[PDB]
Structure 1
Amino acid sequence: MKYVVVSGGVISGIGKGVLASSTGMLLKTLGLKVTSIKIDPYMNIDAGTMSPLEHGECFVLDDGGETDLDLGNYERYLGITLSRDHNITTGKIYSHVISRERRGDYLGKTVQIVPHLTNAIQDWIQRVSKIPVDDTGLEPDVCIIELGGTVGDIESAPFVEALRQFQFEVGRENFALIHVSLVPVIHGEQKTKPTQAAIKDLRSLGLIPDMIACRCSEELNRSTIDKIAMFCHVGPEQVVNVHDVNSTYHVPLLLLKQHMIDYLHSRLKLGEVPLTLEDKERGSQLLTNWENMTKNLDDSDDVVKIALVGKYTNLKDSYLSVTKSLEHASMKCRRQLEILWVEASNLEPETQEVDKNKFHDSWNKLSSADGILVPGGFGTRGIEGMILAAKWARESGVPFLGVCLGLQVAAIEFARNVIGRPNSSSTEFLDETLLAPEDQVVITMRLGLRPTIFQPNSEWSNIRKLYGEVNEVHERHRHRYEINPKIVNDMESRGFIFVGKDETGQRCEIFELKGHPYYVGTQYHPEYTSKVLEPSRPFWGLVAAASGTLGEVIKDINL
């Protein structure tokens, strides 16, 4: 087992998550089996309790774990499945040793942060890195650890102490440290004192960096490389840079151009790892596929515009799996994507009195779009604006996908306007008044990977053809509210077909509307099962439908 810590810097926004995911995928090009662990200094047990306004969305695993967003970067670059154990936190590990001290496994000893908590962290990392995470039976060859927060924040102290010990409690040449660090530019001169201070803060904790990975708005000067490589122990080829490029898929090839594998191939002795003839082929094949999708982003120009309608769209981190799911679906179509970020509340007619500027801009953006997405996220702000987007998309025949809350919004819209029930509404917020036209109801969560069964007549639907006309689908759920199953037959008779349901019925999971080119919704989040070469099927439907060629996509999928 090899370990690669990706760590620290001078700021919390530095973009470690891209570099960790990219470093792991580059190791996967050698054919190595790879896994990864995110460490969070926060005291929350999970990202589930904490609101999307901080650290972006929670990400859902097959376990039903509501983990930190960074686990999604690993799953979509590395192709692996992660467990709720792969997101370590301060909350998890203090809860673990405190529950263990009350149970008494420490034999009446005094329990202390060193050695007992730092040995508990090292036991967690040793257990969790040996969980098999590919579909194959094998234990991973390499583990990427991403150390969240910044080095020398008091929040991090047990993890920087544990990782010092770990560099010896596992062999050297089985452990290596990448430090990620800020190189700000002032008056056009590339200033280095922030990264020199961060390299000292690592040495103060006994962590010694094997590569320094600069984050900068420029190519590093050869003087900027030398002034760091002379201050730190790293050689000139071990001062990595990652530029402020928009395409995060280019980062693996920007690291490969900087010869970063050729250092880790020595520094971790990756030639001593045994590999089969299948492994080297499936490794090199994966690199050629990534050269092709990045070539397609360099030379595809013909924009498809998708409008994304939701709360707090200024927090673009709040929708990162949607963004990445749309980008995978646009690459599969060989088309460039624009996302138009529509703050759903500004669509509402009250905005035309309160701030007439925001009203006209938000309705410009929505009218402009070749297809529409309503992305999910609980909370009562802007839902009539999201209902207005679903209405516009139904009436103007514009491709629509509704994910989680977006499906319920389309059901409420179709009830208010096509069934003509003018006060039909979500149970989430009006039930203090005990309303009879319930569109949502409660059914304390439904979470993680679940089976959807396609209902027997559904063979016609564009969405069931996108799932290869298979009878069942596996996707990740997260909801407490679902469509009222008393009203379902009214919608299924008026043409809004609930194409798929849970095994028990009375719990709707996919709809497609008869008489529209692509108007679809899902109760699950299709984003989380997206992979770079195999996009999320409902999103491959939406981004093909917006472009045209949805028939040719379905004809392809029938091979």
Structure 2
Amino acid sequence: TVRIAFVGKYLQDAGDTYFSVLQCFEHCQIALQVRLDILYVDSEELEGPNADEARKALLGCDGIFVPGGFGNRGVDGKCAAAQVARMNNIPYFGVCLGMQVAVIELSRNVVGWSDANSEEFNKESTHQVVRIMDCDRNKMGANMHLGACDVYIVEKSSIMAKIYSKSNIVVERHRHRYEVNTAYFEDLRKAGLCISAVTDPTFSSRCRVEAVENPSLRFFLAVQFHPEFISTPMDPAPTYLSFMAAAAKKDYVWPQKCSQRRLK
């Protein structure tokens, strides 16, 4: 059995929020032939004076997963999940908010910006490592990115390159508003983060980060897109599949060519 820490809420109070996420995990479970055992962890237990108690629970897991979530509930705990993963070489997979907390985590604990945050959770931060792009913004509000988008895999040695069968461009679907702040790419890179996929291969101020990795570690990957929006039992999301593979301590044969479901 493969123990995965699922960092968000208890089953009781999740509703149907993780319906598609759990479907994807199930596609993967079948493709890999592994007994998945998800630990549903309340992210708020990973913050405060007692958090070492919750951290211990994560250390006994084979993988640590942070899904998309809503509001600012448990952001510091989700960052703390990413920290445990990074410091202990426990496979990590983050989706949307899961990628944002990997960035915030790294900014606080390695870059040394104690006040690093997303603009979403702390408008007063002097290190808004995640923020709304200027081109998306109004005086009244900002774009809600939904739908399909070209994703450029820009690091040939990355997890992304591998799991998408060396395709240079793939197509994934979105639901987000805030992007990684392009002004801090150097600092993130210096701190060990690889920007492995982007919307714009020239890395301008309009370059939207689609995937980050930490190649010092066995498996540390976080994506902006929601991979669970494209997954079937026969064609599971490669991102989720590779995470579960790493957690199970198993290999997997990637196809010679990326499935057409994720190509233009």
**Taking structure 2 as the reference length, what is the TM-score of the superposition?**
0.86
Letter of the structure 2 residue corresponding to residue 366 of structure 1: L
Work out whether residues 153 and 160 of structure 2, in 8 Å CA contact, stay in contact via their aligned partners in 1: no
Q: For the structure 1 residues 484 and 313, does the alpha-carbon distance in structure 2 shift closer, same or farther, using more than 3 Å as the test?
A: farther
Letter of the structure 1 residue corresponding to residue 7 of structure 2: V
Match of 1:439 in 2: 129
Q: How many residues align?
A: 243
Specify which of 497, 514, 536 is matched with residue 237 of structure 2.
536
Letter of the structure 2 residue corresponding to residue 542 of structure 1: F
For the pair 1:478 / 2:168, whether they are aligned, the reply is: no
Residue 512 of structure 1 deviates from its aligned partner by 1.2
Residue 485 of structure 1 deviates from its aligned partner by 0.5
Match of 1:449 in 2: 148
For the pair 1:319 / 2:18, whether they are aligned, the reply is: yes
After superposition, what is the alpha-carbon deviation per residue over 1:153-202, rounded to whole angstroms, capped at 9, x for unaligned? xxxxxxxxxxxxxxxxxxxxxxxxxxxxxxxxxxxxxxxxxxxxxxxxxx
Q: Which runs of 5+ in 2 are unaligned?
A: 134-142, 258-264
Work out whether residues 313 and 342 of structure 1, in 8 Å CA contact, stay in contact via their aligned partners in 2: no
Moved over 4 A (4+): none
Match of 2:7 in 1: 309
After superposition, what is the alpha-carbon deviation per residue over 1:113-151, rounded to whole angstroms, capped at 9, x for unaligned? xxxxxxxxxxxxxxxxxxxxxxxxxxxxxxxxxxxxxxx
2:15 and 2:246 mapped to 1: Cα distance? 24
SS of residue in 2 equivalent to 1:534 = coil
After superposition, what is the alpha-carbon deviation per residue over 1:481-505, rounded to whole angstroms, capped at 9, x for unaligned? 1110100122123320110111374
**Residues 11-410 of structure 1: pairs in structure 2 closer than 5 A:** 303-311=1-9, 313-314=11-12, 315=14, 317-350=16-49, 352=50, 360=53, 362-410=54-102
Residue 377 of structure 1 deviates from its aligned partner by 1.4
Match of 1:165 in 2: none
Letter of the structure 2 residue corresponding to residue 441 of structure 1: R
Match of 1:519 in 2: 220
1:556 and 1:464 mapped to 2: Cα distance? 11
2:121 and 2:65 mapped to 1: Cα distance? 23
Letter of the structure 2 residue corresponding to residue 438 of structure 1: Q
Residue 365 of structure 1 deviates from its aligned partner by 3.4
Q: For the structure 1 residues 499 and 556, does the alpha-carbon distance in structure 2 shift closer, same or farther, using more than 3 Å as the test?
A: closer
Match of 1:462 in 2: 159
SS of residue in 2 equivalent to 1:401 = strand
Residue 349 of structure 1 deviates from its aligned partner by 2.0
Work out whether residues 2 and 37 of structure 2, in 8 Å CA contact, stay in contact via their aligned partners in 1: yes
Letter of the structure 1 residue corresponding to residue 171 of structure 2: H
Work out whether residues 311 and 382 of structure 1, in 8 Å CA contact, stay in contact via their aligned partners in 2: no
Residue 436 of structure 1 deviates from its aligned partner by 2.0
Larger relative contact order (CA 8 Å, sep ≥ 6)? 2
Residue 347 of structure 1 deviates from its aligned partner by 1.3
For the pair 1:419 / 2:114, whether they are aligned, the reply is: no
SS of residue in 2 equivalent to 1:369 = coil
Residue 368 of structure 1 deviates from its aligned partner by 2.3
Residue 388 of structure 1 deviates from its aligned partner by 0.6
Letter of the structure 2 residue corresponding to residue 523 of structure 1: Q
Percent of aligned positions with the same letter in both sequences?
Answer: 35
CA RMSD of aligned residues (A): 1.8
Work out whether residues 463 and 541 of structure 1, in 8 Å CA contact, stay in contact via their aligned partners in 2: no
* Structure with the higher helix share, 1 or 2: 1
Letter of the structure 2 residue corresponding to residue 425 of structure 1: N
Q: Which runs of 5+ in 1 are unaligned?
A: 1-302
1:330 and 1:343 mapped to 2: Cα distance? 23
Residue 557 of structure 1 deviates from its aligned partner by 2.8
Letter of the structure 2 residue corresponding to residue 307 of structure 1: A
Residue 556 of structure 1 deviates from its aligned partner by 3.9
Residue 311 of structure 1 deviates from its aligned partner by 4.1
